[PDB]
Amino acid sequence: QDVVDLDFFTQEPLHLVSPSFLSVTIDANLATDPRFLILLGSPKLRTLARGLSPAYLRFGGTKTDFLIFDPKKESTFEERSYWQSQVNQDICKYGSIPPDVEEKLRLEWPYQEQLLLREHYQKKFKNSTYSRSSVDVLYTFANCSGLDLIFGLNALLRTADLQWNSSNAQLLLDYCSSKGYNISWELGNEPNSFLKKADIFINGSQLGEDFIQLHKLLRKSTFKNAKLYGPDVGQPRRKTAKMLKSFLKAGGEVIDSVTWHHYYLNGRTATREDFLNPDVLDIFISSVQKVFQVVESTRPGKKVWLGETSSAYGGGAPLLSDTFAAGFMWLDKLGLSARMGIEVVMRQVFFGAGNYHLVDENFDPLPDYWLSLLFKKLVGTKVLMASVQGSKRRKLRVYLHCTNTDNPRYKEGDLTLYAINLHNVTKYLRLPYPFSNKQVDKYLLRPLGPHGLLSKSVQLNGLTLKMVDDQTLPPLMEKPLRPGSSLGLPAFSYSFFVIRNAKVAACI
Ligand SMILES: *[C@@H]1O[C@H](CO)[C@@H](O[C@@H]2O[C@H](CO)[C@@H](O[C@@H]3O[C@H](CO)[C@@H](O)[C@H](O)[C@@H]3O)[C@H](O)[C@H]2NC(C)=O)[C@H](O)[C@H]1NC(C)=O
Ligand SMILES: *[C@@H]1O[C@H](CO[C@@H]2O[C@@H](C)[C@@H](O)[C@@H](O)[C@@H]2O)[C@@H](O)[C@H](O)[C@H]1NC(C)=O
Ligand SMILES: *[C@@H]1O[C@H](CO)[C@@H](O)[C@H](O)[C@H]1NC(C)=O
Ligand SMILES: *[C@@H]1O[C@H](CO)[C@@H](O)[C@H](O)[C@H]1NC(C)=O
């Protein structure tokens, strides 16, 4: 019997996630050579980013601590040409990249991506500077896409006696004020590895004092209520958890959320079997619990965010992080993050170097994009609970929220269920009373073509998902089911199910 009874716990929300729960990053290394930020002027990338609104866009990464704002930095032919074409034009409606500039940057980009990835793996970072125009590219991309920019400041600018030197930050904050920019801030990226990356050790008490310093600058700015997030530590291995604890004790008062990072695997060694292994999926739960321990003992009730996360570190697992098979880790991470109290999850990366990107080198969406878009359209902020009967929940993983209220097909009280089947056979889910004779809309994702799970193309209810054109996402078409029918989930797949007229009081 491959028929599994669901239990639903709908009486009240377990947690409330932000409307921006599914958020994204742009790696700070896109600014190593700032010409490549102009790729963010693509109308195709804008269309795709808009599909994920509301969301935060976090500009950060290892390079956050090797970037220096220079208000007099010279621009390049690419940058000068891009900005010259936007003059006297509504950039959000009509902005594009000049075709010569677009062609050149796209020819150079695969070399650049190799450089960025190898620089990362060798841990040989140099300081580089970025201009006012670079800031403007990031700001307008985010603003035109309906995203909220979070900008990571360089925490390795240091005085003689090991204190953060805030003078470059001040330059930047003043520039942003003078343009009317609504930006939230971070300081430093993965401070736990500063010793390896820069042979400077900054401990968490000191980093907290640095955050205190920054908060004081933000209070004196024209944007007095700008938000401040930190400390963007790596996942909570012993020394990292100790550093998080000391940081929160010293600087925990001035941060609006606690940010940490997670990757399941080393991209160099990850296997196909690891991507489908529920034991790999389950280790994320240990990371989450350790984080909440540190936070509850120092700043209880403080919001906890995943500030940078994906399948595999080192730029992603080649031939795996950009596939349908990467969806199991991504959907499960969202499911668990919601159910365990994480308020925002920031996906490394929307676009950029690596293959854990949502959108590729030709600005085409990967399967994880489509998964993210369907999640955004269907899943609401109120987290409920589901479970499967029989204590084999490892391979059939289920999550339940109120249906997204912004969705015009659905109404107050409707439920969105989502489910992952990691068995090698089809499973059938039976809804419990009082949801057992309802109209249900199915949204089943399956990979397209001969590579099966390793495909980079995906179908929704048997229709290939593809952008209509550069300005247009497709409709995501439900498959209505017979009332009372069980919910069928093929081997190695994932699906959403919207329970219509469910009338759940908690979702109203
Ligand atoms: C976290 O990092 C800070 C460094 O920013 C450490 O603070 C420093 O700690 C040492 C104590 O071992 C201080 O050295 C002492 O200085 C006094 C003079 O002020 C001198 O009388 C002592 O003989 C000794 O040399 C140093 O001043 C201090 N710096 C600051 C700015 O406070 C801190 O100890 C570290 N904490 C942990 C738990 O690792
Ligand atoms: C499939 O997985 C097996 C273990 O899973 C169990 O058996 C399968 C057929 C389903 O009934 C599932 O619900 C069970 O949890 C492995 O031992 C077996 O080697 C695998 N079979 C194939 C054909 O790959
Ligand atoms: C980067 O520049 C800052 C100040 O401009 C300096 O303190 C730091 O040591 C430099 N680091 C590297 C790795 O070049
Ligand atoms: C901070 O950095 C600025 C700009 O590089 C430098 O001129 C200044 O001396 C530094 N301040 C301290 C307190 O070290």
Swiss-Prot record:
Post-translational modification: Proteolytically processed. The cleavage of the 65 kDa form leads to the generation of a linker peptide, and 8 kDa and 50 kDa products. The active form, the 8/50 kDa heterodimer, is resistant to degradation. Complete removal of the linker peptide appears to be a prerequisite to the complete activation of the enzyme.
Keywords linked to the UniProt accession: Calcium, Cell adhesion, Disulfide bond, Glycoprotein, Hydrolase, Lysosome, Magnesium, Membrane, Nucleus, Secreted, Signal
Coiled coil stretches, renumbered: none
Residue segments, region Required for heterodimerization with the heparanase 8 kDa subunit: 253-382
Propiece residues: 75-122
Consequence when changing residue 507 to A: Abolishes processing, secretion and enzyme activity
Effect noted on mutating residue 123 to A: No association with GS-modified heparin
GO cellular component, one term: lysosome
Catalytic activity: endohydrolysis of (1->4)-beta-D-glycosidic bonds of heparan sulfate chains in heparan sulfate proteoglycan
Function, as annotated: Endoglycosidase that cleaves heparan sulfate proteoglycans (HSPGs) into heparan sulfate side chains and core proteoglycans. Participates in extracellular matrix (ECM) degradation and remodeling. Selectively cleaves the linkage between a glucuronic acid unit and an N-sulfo glucosamine unit carrying either a 3-O-sulfo or a 6-O-sulfo group. Can also cleave the linkage between a glucuronic acid unit and an N-sulfo glucosamine unit carrying a 2-O-sulfo group, but not linkages between a glucuronic acid unit and a 2-O-sulfated iduronic acid moiety.
Protein family: Belongs to the glycosyl hydrolase 79 family.
Official protein name in the record: Heparanase
Source organism of the structure: Homo sapiens
